[PDB]
Write a protein that binds this ligand. Sequence first.
Ligand SMILES: *[B]([O])([O])C1=[C]C([N]S(=O)(=O)C2=[C]C(S(=O)(=O)C3=[C][C]=[C][C]=[C]3)=[C]S2)=C(C([O])=O)[C]=[C]1
Ligand SMILES: *[B]([O])([O])C1=[C]C([N]S(=O)(=O)C2=[C]C(S(=O)(=O)C3=[C][C]=[C][C]=[C]3)=[C]S2)=C(C([O])=O)[C]=[C]1
Lengths: 358, 358
Amino acid sequence: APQQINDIVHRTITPLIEQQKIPGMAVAVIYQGKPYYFTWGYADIAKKQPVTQQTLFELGSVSKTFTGVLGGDAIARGEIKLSDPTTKYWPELTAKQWNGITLLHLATYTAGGLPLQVPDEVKSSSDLLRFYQNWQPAWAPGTQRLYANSSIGLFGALAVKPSGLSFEQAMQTRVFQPLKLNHTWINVPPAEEKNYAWGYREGKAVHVSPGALDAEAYGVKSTIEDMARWVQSNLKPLDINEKTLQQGIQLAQSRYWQTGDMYQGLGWEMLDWPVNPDSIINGSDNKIALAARPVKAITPPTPAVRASWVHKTGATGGFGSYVAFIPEKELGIVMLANKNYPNPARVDAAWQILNALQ
Amino acid sequence: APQQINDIVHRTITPLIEQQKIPGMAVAVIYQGKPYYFTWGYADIAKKQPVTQQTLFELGSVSKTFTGVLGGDAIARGEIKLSDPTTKYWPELTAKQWNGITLLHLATYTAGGLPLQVPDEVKSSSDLLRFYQNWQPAWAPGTQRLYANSSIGLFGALAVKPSGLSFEQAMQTRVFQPLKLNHTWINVPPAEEKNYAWGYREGKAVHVSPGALDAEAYGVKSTIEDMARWVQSNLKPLDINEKTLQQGIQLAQSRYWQTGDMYQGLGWEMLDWPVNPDSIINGSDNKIALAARPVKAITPPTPAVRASWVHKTGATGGFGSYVAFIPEKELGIVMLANKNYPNPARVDAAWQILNALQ
Ligand SMILES: *[B]([O])([O])C1=[C]C([N]S(=O)(=O)C2=[C]C(S(=O)(=O)C3=[C][C]=[C][C]=[C]3)=[C]S2)=C(C([O])=O)[C]=[C]1
Ligand SMILES: *[B]([O])([O])C1=[C]C([N]S(=O)(=O)C2=[C]C(S(=O)(=O)C3=[C][C]=[C][C]=[C]3)=[C]S2)=C(C([O])=O)[C]=[C]1
């Protein structure tokens, strides 16, 4: 634990925790490829359980990065193609608005306005079918980006159909296990409930509620150690043995669309490095990250760029997460909290830390 | 070499040499990853110099597969992007018709009708510039594929621009050398002239003549063992130590475009395996291969497919070549002759051999 890293992390995080009134937090800095952990506060306030390197946190939409890589792995396996029509994998989706909507569009939120949330009324496979059949796009495919669980969520469910495996079974078998993420779950096992931190919203202990496509859009829970390992994997996919998984990670970091100084990947979002702090800090604010924005197509997509600031924010009703890394510097960071707080604060703290380490 | 291979090669190639009256020939069959060589006739009729594993043949447009991989390597290095306008690498190309024409278009013959040949009168950099500034499109970019030295030739020249290296130096240091192709040259040095075979056209001995963008479009000369090595590298790039070259080879085999049952890559052309022999055999006829055909964009490109028949025909006034391989079966073949005989005959022979072997 070099003092250099120790000081910047504590000087940055300590004030953050107090200002935002965060109950518990865990941080990992990947420096020169090695991980360094830090923890604060409580996982369970009621029974004074502290946050440890084994505490499980709800990742919220950071889960989308796993979904993007799983999809990319299915592509490398030749099971699917981003160029394939959404109907090729779900024939019963006969409504005319689907005609030219591809898996690429679903994966990158550019299908034409799929909604941020899948209605709570949707549950059955049938209910899900009606939802997408009755949906009316606002724009043509590939013209505008609208962040949505309905898009990437569907991408995830369809990308695994050729496998014959459940989305969960495919994730654990093709991503979790190969990478040694032995404490990363879509469904928390009874044996791990003791490590499952509680989330806090308005002082109440809460856990994410079940919902259609939850696993594919915001259902993963992990530890700071597994997330650090997840970061190292995305930092240097070349060190991964499973050929298709190595390839899947590279595809998830490719640049498919551009809006402003931001590039959309599969789950991951990227910006050229050196990046402008204000661009990423102010860009993370929901009011901006959730808005409808026209996109320019990158034809063909740009293969993962080493000199990039790769990241993803994530939240549930009671948790707030953030992951960011720079492949070219072999530097990265993970911040997990059992309190949902402003994205700008997360990104500012991460920037302050990584910029200080180079 | 196993009698299975010796048997099918001897019964297929020897009759071919007799029928086409080929002076000299070299064939290499890659079986289960290992190469086996066969040679016939003379490299130099007068002086009766035999064809050996050290004989250099002019590859013709098979050179385009090298240009494609060098281009792919430059992409992997982050020096260029296929999405970028052609004018970004050639600020001098200001004519309005070039707006919208990207490196991708140049590399895949989809620019809009760039001519098959660069006029013989065009020599200087000055001649080249006004030639391109004066070119007028037959179609809009990205709509029709017209095989041409003018397109891929310019792609090659611009692709190495960022490196500051010459095309020959870039190719030598980034492709030939890392793959141990120690007897492959763009410009044959004095010490290798005794191994440089003569081509034959109407009985007269001939060598390819100099021309604008020749190096980038049809200027490579190689031996049968170097080419077998080239096939092995393209068969399984995961065995290549140089990261960017490994990726560059995989990029050259990606499917950017589709016309009929064939897909256009960077230099390489591919078809799904199993393939209809009649398709590739008749499709090889220049009456077809040199004709414009509408293309369907593959958005985004499909990463190199293992179950593919990958190939490329090549010829000069005195030479005829052919290379083809099937990644999924670690099977491939190289055919070099110092006589330019019909493409369909080359492809039929090659299909007879590989189909008998797998
Ligand atoms: B992702 O973290 O960007 C994300 C995830 C979800 N699904 S969820 O069930 O995890 C919930 C998140 C919230 S929230 O208040 O953090 C939020 C964040 C952004 C936009 C709206 C609400 C409450 S439940 C959603 C979702 O369900 O809308 C959105 C984004
Ligand atoms: B490529 O082999 O498909 C190719 C190469 C060239 N350049 S070249 O200077 O090597 C010449 C080739 C010929 S040719 O008669 O073998 C031929 C082959 C295929 C199509 C047309 C002509 C004569 S010079 C060219 C070119 O036009 O210079 C075309 C294709």
